[PDB]
Amino acid sequence: IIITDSPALVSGAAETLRHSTLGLTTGAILIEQNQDFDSTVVDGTGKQNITRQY
Amino acid sequence: ALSDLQVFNDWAYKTMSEVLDQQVELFNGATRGAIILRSAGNTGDLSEAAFWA
Amino acid sequence: ALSDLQVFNDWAYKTMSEVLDQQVELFNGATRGAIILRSAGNTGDLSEAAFWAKIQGLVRPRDPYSNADVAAKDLRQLVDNTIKVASGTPPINIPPSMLRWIQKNPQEAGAVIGQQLAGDTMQDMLNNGLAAGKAAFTAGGAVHDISAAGTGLMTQRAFNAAQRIFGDRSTDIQVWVSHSSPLFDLYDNALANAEQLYVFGTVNVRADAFGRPIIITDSPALVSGAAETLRHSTLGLTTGAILIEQNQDFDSTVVDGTGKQNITRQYQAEWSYNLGVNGYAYDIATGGKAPNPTALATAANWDKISTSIKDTGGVVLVTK
Numbered sequence A: 001i002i003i004t005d006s007p008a009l010v011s012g013a014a015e016t017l018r019h020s021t022l023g024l025t026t027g028a029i030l031i032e033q034n035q036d037f038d039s040t041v042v043d044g045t046g047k048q049n050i051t052r053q054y
Numbered sequence B: 001a002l003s004d005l006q007v008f009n010d011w012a013y014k015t016m017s018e019v020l021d022q023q024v025e026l027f028n029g030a031t032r033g034a035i036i037l038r039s040a041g042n043t044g045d046l047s048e049a050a051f052w053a
Numbered sequence C: 001a002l003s004d005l006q007v008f009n010d011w012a013y014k015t016m017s018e019v020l021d022q023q024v025e026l027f028n029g030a031t032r033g034a035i036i037l038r039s040a041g042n043t044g045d046l047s048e049a050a051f052w053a054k055i056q057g058l059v060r061p062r063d064p065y066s067n068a069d070v071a072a073k074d075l076r077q078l079v080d081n082t083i084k085v086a087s088g089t090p091p092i093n094i095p096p097s098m099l100r101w102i103q104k105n106p107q108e109a110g111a112v113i114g115q116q117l118a119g120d121t122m123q124d125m126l127n128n129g130l131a132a133g134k135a136a137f138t139a140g141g142a143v144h145d146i147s148a149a150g151t152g153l154m155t156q157r158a159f160n161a162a163q164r165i166f167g168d169r170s171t172d173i174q175v176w177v178s179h180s181s182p183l184f185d186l187y188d189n190a191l192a193n194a195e196q197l198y199v200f201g202t203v204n205v206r207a208d209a210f211g212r213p214i215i216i217t218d219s220p221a222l223v224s225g226a227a228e229t230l231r232h233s234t235l236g237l238t239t240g241a242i243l244i245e246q247n248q249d250f251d252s253t254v255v256d257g258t259g260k261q262n263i264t265r266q267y268q269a270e271w272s273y274n275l276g277v278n279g280y281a282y283d284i285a286t287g288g289k290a291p292n293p294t295a296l297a298t299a300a301n302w303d304k305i306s307t308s309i310k311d312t313g314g315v316v317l318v319t320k
Helices: C096-101 C106-140 C156-163 C180-192
Strands: A029-032 B035-038 C035-039 C049-052 C077-080 C085-088 C143-145 C231-235 C242-246 C251-257 C264-276 C316-319
Touching: C035 C106, C085 C106, C096 C106, C106 C231, C106 C242, C106 C264, C106 C316, C143 C156, C156 C316, C180 C231
Parallel strands: A029 B035, C035 C242, C143 C316
Antiparallel strands: C049 C077, C085 C264, C231 C316, C242 C264, C251 C264
């Protein structure tokens, strides 16, 4: 019984609180990471302080 | 008199940070292959595969 | 030459640009250690320092032929702080186009900005330190106003009256930071009359009758008002009277932009200096003037913890 605190497995609250346990076969869920990461850091000018964002 | 003194208190900044709160090791062997985690990059929004009915 | 030949007036681009127009060389030796420019890293809005307090009556007359009970005494510790003043540079349009047009590199523009800032940065530090100086000295009560007295113009006598506050610390006084205007009025008076008759006129090229050199500067921190309300301020700083701990937190950015005829490039710089210890033991009241000062927060809200006014270093002289 794999255990994880996943929000996808809880809904409702108090009397409406329900829990979903899913039993999987081999290869039931496939996540193919597209290895396509795009990261950038942009700075800014014209403010009391330099503005850097991620 | 300690009261007549100026008490300073150790100040510091931990170099680490909280990263998560949920066990997310649920891939491949972790799920006996139930949830597969591959690094397969594919083109377009859909990767369809037709099979005989 | 002549019309037949062609004259080509030669030309050049000067590497050195105009830096400043105000005397800002008032640091360390230039001011006899009155104002100290130090480089250190300070964390937080300010930096506190706790020094043990002086014990009053620490030495007592002793009688070997007697043994009477002597009152006990306790130790105390005073704490002075050092506020952090932040200064920045507005966006500077530095498009590469203009540089390339006259065959120059944008780097050259960056170097010019840096060489102008070098002087403008020390100017702000000095002006703010001078403003904090008057504020701390007004708060401490070491003020002498001759403006109401007679013409209110500065005289050699004013120096003695101002230094009188520090009885034995009068000699410890290093220089007399003042404005150019009151200095001219001082000499004008002596040059007009009573030179080597009432006052020691032009005792030195620019010093007081006690030898302390007078370092004049066109600092706004030393002029307040106009016409009849115009008043001048002269600081009799002692050694270590002012301390400028320039924090090594200088930052800068080069943000270029598109969407225009030519690449729009800008330059913004930011830095901070722990300006504090405005006197042996003067503590700025950050709680009453916010954590980050804006050169106006001081408002003479500095606190004095020194047991004696002589301990604290620096006196303010106010003249018309």
